[PDB]
Nucleic acid binder design. Sequence first.
DNA 1: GTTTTTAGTTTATTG
DNA 2: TAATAAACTAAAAAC
DNA 3: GTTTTTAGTTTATTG
DNA 4: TAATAAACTAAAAAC
DNA 5: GTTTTTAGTTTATTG
DNA 6: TAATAAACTAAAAAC
Lengths: 226, 227, 226, 227, 227, 226
Amino acid sequence: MRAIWTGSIAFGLVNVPVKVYSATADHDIRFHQVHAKDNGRIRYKRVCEACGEVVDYRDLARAYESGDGQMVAITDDDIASLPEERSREIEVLEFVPAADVDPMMFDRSYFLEPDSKSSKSYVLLAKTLAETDRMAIVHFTLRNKTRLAALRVKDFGKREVMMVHTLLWPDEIRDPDFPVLDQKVEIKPAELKMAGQVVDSMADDFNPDRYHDTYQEQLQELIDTK
Amino acid sequence: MRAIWTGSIAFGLVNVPVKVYSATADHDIRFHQVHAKDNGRIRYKRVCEACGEVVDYRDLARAYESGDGQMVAITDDDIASLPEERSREIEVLEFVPAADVDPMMFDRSYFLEPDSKSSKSYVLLAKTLAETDRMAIVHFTLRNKTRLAALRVKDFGKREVMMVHTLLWPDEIRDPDFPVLDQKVEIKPAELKMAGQVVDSMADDFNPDRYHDTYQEQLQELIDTKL
Amino acid sequence: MRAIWTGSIAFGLVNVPVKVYSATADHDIRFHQVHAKDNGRIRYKRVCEACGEVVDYRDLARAYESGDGQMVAITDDDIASLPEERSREIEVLEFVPAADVDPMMFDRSYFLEPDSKSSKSYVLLAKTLAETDRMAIVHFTLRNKTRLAALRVKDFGKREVMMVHTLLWPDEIRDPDFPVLDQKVEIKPAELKMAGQVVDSMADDFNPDRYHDTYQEQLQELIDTK
Amino acid sequence: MRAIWTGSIAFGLVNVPVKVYSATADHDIRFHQVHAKDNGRIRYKRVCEACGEVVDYRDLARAYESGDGQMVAITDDDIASLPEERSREIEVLEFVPAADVDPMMFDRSYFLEPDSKSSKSYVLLAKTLAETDRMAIVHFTLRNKTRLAALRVKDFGKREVMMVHTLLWPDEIRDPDFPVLDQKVEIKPAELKMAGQVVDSMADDFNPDRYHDTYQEQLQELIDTKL
Amino acid sequence: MRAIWTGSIAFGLVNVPVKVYSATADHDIRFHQVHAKDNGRIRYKRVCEACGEVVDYRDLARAYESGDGQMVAITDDDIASLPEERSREIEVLEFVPAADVDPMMFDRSYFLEPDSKSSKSYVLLAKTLAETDRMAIVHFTLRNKTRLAALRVKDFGKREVMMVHTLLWPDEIRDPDFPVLDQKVEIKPAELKMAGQVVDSMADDFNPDRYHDTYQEQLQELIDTKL
Amino acid sequence: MRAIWTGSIAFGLVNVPVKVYSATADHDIRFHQVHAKDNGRIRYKRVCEACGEVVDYRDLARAYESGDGQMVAITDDDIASLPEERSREIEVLEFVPAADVDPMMFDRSYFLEPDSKSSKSYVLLAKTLAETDRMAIVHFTLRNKTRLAALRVKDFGKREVMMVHTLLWPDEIRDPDFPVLDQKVEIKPAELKMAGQVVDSMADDFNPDRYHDTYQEQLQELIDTK
DNA sequence: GTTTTTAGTTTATTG
DNA sequence: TAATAAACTAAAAAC
DNA sequence: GTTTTTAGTTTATTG
DNA sequence: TAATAAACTAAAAAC
DNA sequence: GTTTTTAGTTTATTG
DNA sequence: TAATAAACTAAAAAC
């Protein structure tokens, strides 16, 4: 439970230093390679296929899997050139309505809170964002990696906190084609009514606490065995 | 156009056949390590820290690394002990309005491809879901792994496609334990309106197409330059 | 052994693939024609009477006799007008108690089969039918033709199997208006007692094993000796 | 409206007169063909293939094709050998409980009818059959052909008349070989009860009045238009 | 010349069809009254004693005469009251050994005519009755009249047919007592043998050919001579 | 009840004068045609067809109606000439076995009683016939009318008496010509057993006292009413 | 290729 | 004597 | 084109 | 002296 | 100075 | 089969 990195968002003149904190962390139990004879850890290493010898990662240059399979040498100049990656401060670009954004845009989120002991400006920003209902957007960066992001505030039982989302690039989504789907189909009003009552009978409330990972429960039992 | 997964919605007796296709593809291209000296691709191998000797991935066991350092190879029966492990069909549990589910749980997303023979049933299901406007929370199986997910109706105009979103586990969202905001804060209505005036002056609607990634453009330029 | 068609029950959401099969095949020896003198198989070719010569089957035109025998001019378009042909799935309409159905219209029979690996809904529907003990009336379709048919289950001991029986149209059945049986009838107890005695004397159980198509067996001996 | 047959039930001494009737006459319009360009009704003609010449029907030789299709010479006397064709009385073999027979063996139905002289015996036999509620497996005969058949009573609203339906030879019925269905299947309670509720929702009584052959009505109206 | 009566046996439900033919007819030549003087046959016209007037068949009413001498007109409606009187078919009540019924009660004989289409039941009834050899006592109704009768199997060298014999009512037979034979009679064995030897000496089997109507023969000869 | 006549039975030299008593008499109610309005008996006179005039029996000469219809005159001399009819006694002609005589042959009977006060001969003949069972046949005559007859022994409930039978002439029996039944037939042993068992079920004891003339019983009851 | 089902003829039987 | 059932081909469809 | 009831003769022998 | 129990007759309907 | 937490690969299996 | 599980490693800031 430690901050990933510092954050300074420059909203006009008034900049709020905000510290980010991970909102999630894998529930699954993480294992590592253990040879039965060894009963010890196993680690990979960069072994050159043409050379046939172990090499260090620094010597090796990352290459994209080109269709031609030709050689590529990663150069830090490309990434270093961009100023967004260098800028450790948070960047505010626009506010967009919550209804405008759809489920897809959300990928990952983290909490947000102000570094300074004065949570005033943060409180006003969160409250005005809630009133306007225009989720703010940020070209967020981390470890010299920029990425579009969005802001939202949620009221927990004890308190309310503003927080961020990891926003996928809209170009990335690939709309599908289902030629069979577009074929015309008719619906029977009686069949419609039957479907409605069936779903209502199956319909119920929301029970997040009831949902559980049977696989993770088995993992918990296994670790109890260990 | 690549069918990642196939099956059928095993909801009760509905068993509407469906094919699953990955909804979104990452713009970035996976990288394979290469050494400028070697002038070719590179493939790693595995050596222990106590063997000091290369051991193929097959002989290595999947054992947890506990704090005590004890490591026990994972039992295969326990791996497959889940009754739903075999499943090759998406299974439904419940239905609920969308507002009930919290967006944070959303992790990944796939599209659902129906079949002509059952096209009537799928279309009717989509219509009833749209009318009731009530999301559906459904178990999910994929390459011998279970994952919790929900599905909803999405419209591409006259084309409307049902889709599934992988949902993060309930316990995954960790609450914040923060004293910094536990201190009481007072808000001035004058400053509230002063901030809101700008908040609404610079406000604009969603423009997903307008935004572009400079990093991907630089990557494409590098790819062109190297070939 | 071969399938007739391959459709899928269509009851609202329920869509369980089915591979219908021919319940009963007529094993009676079918008897070809051969010219006695030529000893060659015969072939039917059609000579139009008023024409005076043969006519191709496609050219042959279809007409109607209205009791008076007068012909009628017809076109394929009107036949195509009806939409029943498009039905290539077994639409379901309504269920009925097994007792209600009458045993004089079970014209022909057809089994069902599971095609998709998802047999679960199949067996679930079969068990629901068996428990409720209500037949299902299904608008069976076949070869651009529709025959109102019953849907029912008959546990074969080894494994429950769902069956569909093609039902004669209720309009087809005729309720004979006999003028004789209405006449008043009187019976004394002695004759009824005698009838019960004789019936119980002849009473026994169905014996499928002891039943053989004597004619078919003898003609099979014939066919063998030749 | 005309009888198809006459005879008597040759069981024991009962020998009640019977006037068999056609249970179900197919009202569906059978649709003759006439050559269009001339408007002349077409007649077939039997022609020898090698000869390419018409042949009398009697001169035709009935033949059978072996598993390889090879012909088989066959003579009338051999068919005449079997005597059961002669029997012109509906003998009786046994009486069986009504529920014993499956609802799939019998396809075609046939009514029965007495002659004024001995209507009393007919009615008494019908009443005894109704009371005992056990069918009669009658070794029906017809048109030099013998067909196993069942005998029961279907009391009409006003009168009770015994009926006979031709019964498929239990040899003809084919059992199913369903290796796929042999696969073990599983069921859960909630889905089962939901499906039962749905079925009960669909529950309803037989409605012969509302049931019609849409195609027959439409085509009949069409021909009415033509005339 | 034709059948006297027709109708199927009404045995329970057995109801074997049959028709009745007069077994025997008088051999004597029937005579018709005539007057030699006027060369004309004679009709009979009936009148009362007080009327002295011609009264036709219709205007003549039936009546009964009592010992007191009073007269009661017969009511035709009550005559046919009993259900059996309206029967148009022979009916059987019970069976009995042949010897049980006395030979005294035998008025008339009749033959039975089988039915071609149902002759099997008729023949089988004949055979079973012959095997058991138990003459069946059966009611009998014809010409609006009722009579007792029994049916017996009689076999001709080439034919075997049941035959119904009119049975005299038991009430008709009467047994007046005679004191003449009430006197005790004693006959010695010597006289017994003396009589029996002659009795067996002149005794011979039936000679039906020898027995014949001599008077009818003479009358027929005279008639032929006149004709 | 009085003897019809006193016919003496002649055999060799020993003759037993024996009276004849009617062994039967119809119990039907007696009816005389009576005019309703008159309520008196009805008598008929015999009227000439051509003459239209009443003719008495004495004036009437009997003749037979041949197919021509012409008179066939008959004289009483021919009937009177027969010695048998003149005789007022009964003469035995042959002794025939009782099993020999068929139930057809006799159609009416009359009790036979001894006229002589000494019934020695009568009882002796009765015993001889009973032991020998050689039915005594006689050319019996009544009213100058001769008919073949047989004389039988019956043991009454107290004693044993002799009665005569009216034997129809052997020519009278008409052998039927029924070619239909001459056609052959097969019998099923199972059906044979069923028929035999049915007969046994219906088989019972002789019940002469039961059989009552329901028609004549109704007539008697009506007379009792009137 | 293959079976199976459907649409009409003929052809013959029963009354 | 026309209604009806039985044998049959051809043809068309579904797989 | 019958063949069997049936009242009324008609008789004939009987207590 | 009167009775009545059996043949002849046609009347009449039935089939 | 040490840790965790995450992005980047980077294999490796599987519909 | 490329997507996805499983794991290695870079770095990265946090106290």
